[PDB]
């Protein structure tokens, strides 16, 4: 039995169990502070509707805040298969300010890109359930969607914002609502007559502290190591059946960057990072006579089939010298995530980490772009020669080519994730690095 293993002890075991330091069979729990969490509704100033910009000020109801969920009530403007993460698309952008200073800013596309790289498995599916219609719902169906915010304080208690320590500064969120949301108020470029306007509500989960923890927060200075998203959009070089386009994009980023992330997309269709094709799920009506490769199967907009992606290869050059050897687009799409995140990234979305663990909170290596002045992202595009309407060509093709419909991916979104420091003293705060 098990005892026969215990007695099998010799020199090779000393490194593992000699002069033992720990056990696994006795947990010591730590005593912690006394706190409670309450979900409190905030009021949105101005008016909610498509294309409108609204904002909210977080009330001083608790001491610290973390999770924020923006609720939206939407009704389908068409049948199942016409929407794609519509509550995510709707919240076009979100700005975060403390003391009137910008701390961060997210974009609907960032939420999509973020998901593409950092969410996984069931949490990711559940996320989809909170922003879309995933049970073949029909026109007129009504759902409340919950779009969680993903600012650093919305991910961990460890970075909760000490509203209590901000006596002289306010904390505000600003939400830009998209003018159009696919399958809700528009179907491609066409408005959906009679579409309903959204109902919106912002919920903030507050932390209530007991006497000693509360008092310390109120009188001591507080410093958090936080994340920020840097972002700039640009035109892509356009590949074609006759050429492999190439492009050198200046990496207009700063501070200690954990990673870069980017995608190529068709700005017409939210979340479309790949070419359209007449293969199941790759276009509206794909697989049948009615198939068109000018419009996506919106409910199946995303895909893992790299044949429909447009990046052949890429490298990052710093101050004129290569940071790493040029690698194929599939390296950035499949391997980087494997090596560092463990999730599965959809075709058309790319990642390059400067960090050992880019998905975590703990710093694990950064590239400081404020110390690099000639940083460039160098891209090579695939040749757009494949007839998207012919599966034999779509599916039987080579590494260096893609769909003729891949030339619709005219926009590129480049993101960077960096560290900064949130410093709070004497009732006021802001960021340490611009």
């Amino acid at each position: 039995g098990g005892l026969s293993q215990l007695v099998a002890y010799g020199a090779q075991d000393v490194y593992l169990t000699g002069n033992p330091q720990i056990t696994f069979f006795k947990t010591v729990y730590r005593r912690y502070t006394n706190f409670a969490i309450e979900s409190i509704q905030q009021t949105i100033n101005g008016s909610v509707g498509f294309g409108n910009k609204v904002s909210t000020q977080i009330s001083r109801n608790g001491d610290l805040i973390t999770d924020i969920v923006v609720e939206f009530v939407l009704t389908k403007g068409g049948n199942g298969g016409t929407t794609y993460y519509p509550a995510e698309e709707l919240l076009q952008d979100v700005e975060l300010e403390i003391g009137g200073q910008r701390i961060d800013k997210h974009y609907n596309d960032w939420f999509r890109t973020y998901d593409a790289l950092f969410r996984m498995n069931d949490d990711r599916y559940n996320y989809r359930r909170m922003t879309d219609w995933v049970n073949n719902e029909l026109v007129g169906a009504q759902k409340r969607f919950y779009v969680p915010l993903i600012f650093f304080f919305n991910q961990t208690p460890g970075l909760a914002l000490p509203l209590i320590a901000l006596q002289y500064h306010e904390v505000k969120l600003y939400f830009t609502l998209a003018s159009q949301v696919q399958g809700v108020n528009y179907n491609g470029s066409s408005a959906i007559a009679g579409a309903a306007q959204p109902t919106m509500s912002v919920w903030v989960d507050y932390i209530f502290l007991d006497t000693q923890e509360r008092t310390r927060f109120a009188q001591l200075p507080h410093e958090y190591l936080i994340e920020q998203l840097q972002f700039t959009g640009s035109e892509t070089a356009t590949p074609s059946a006759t050429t492999q386009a190439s492009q050198n994009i200046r990496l207009n980023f700063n501070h200690p960057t954990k990673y870069l992330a980017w995608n190529f997309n068709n700005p017409t269709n939210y979340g479309q990072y790949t070419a359209l094709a007449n293969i199941p799920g790759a276009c509206s009506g794909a697989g049948t006579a009615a198939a068109t490769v000018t419009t996506p199967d919106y409910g199946n907009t995303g895909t893992y089939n790299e044949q429909l992606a447009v990046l052949d290869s890429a490298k990052i050059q710093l101050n004129g010298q290569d940071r790493f050897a040029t690698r194929k687009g599939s390296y950035f799409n499949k391997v980087q995530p494997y090596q560092s995140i463990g999730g599965v990234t959809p075709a058309g979305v790319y990642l390059y980490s400067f960090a050992l663990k880019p998905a975590g909170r703990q710093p694990s290596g950064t590239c400081n772009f404020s110390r690099i002045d000639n940083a460039t992202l160098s891209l090579t595009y695939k040749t757009c020669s494949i007839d998207a309407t012919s599966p034999a060509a779509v599916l039987g093709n080579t590494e260096t080519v893609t769909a003729n419909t891949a030339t619709l991916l005219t926009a590129l979104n480049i993101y960077a994730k960096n560290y900064n420091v949130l410093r709070i003293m004497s009732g006021m705060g802001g960021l340490a690095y611009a």
Binding site: R216, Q219, L220, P221, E223, Y224, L225
Partner: protein
């Protein structure tokens, strides 16, 4: 009579990396400063960012604050002090080989 109210205030902040600089053998704080300066180790640099000089500055900041104001303050966090020293160091560092004279000026600027 204000002793208790004053005593009541904590003197130990649950700071990220509390006891931030020094207290480690992996690499010197001087080296960190040299690396952000992008300068070679040299007597000017190794004296200015030395533990004894950082200490000198910290003691002066505490003492002078106490002299100028009614307040008792602690040593300042040293990422903040190193960054400031290096910033000041980059924008000045002017001497003709006279390290002592150079240092006098640079400490003056940091303390000030």
């Amino acid at each position: 009579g204000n002793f208790i109210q004053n005593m009541a205030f904590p003197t130990e902040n649950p700071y990220k990396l509390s006891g931030d600089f020094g207290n480690s053998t992996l690499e010197p704080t001087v080296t960190a400063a040299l690396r952000i300066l992008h300068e070679s180790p040299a007597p000017f640099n190794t004296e200015f960012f030395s533990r004894k000089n950082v200490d000198f500055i910290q003691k002066k900041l505490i003492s002078e604050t106490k002299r100028y104001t009614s307040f008792d303050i602690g040593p300042q966090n040293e990422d903040e002090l190193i960054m400031m020293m290096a910033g000041i160091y980059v924008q000045d560092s002017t001497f003709d080989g006279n390290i002592k004279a150079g240092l006098r000026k640079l400490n003056t600027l940091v303390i000030t």
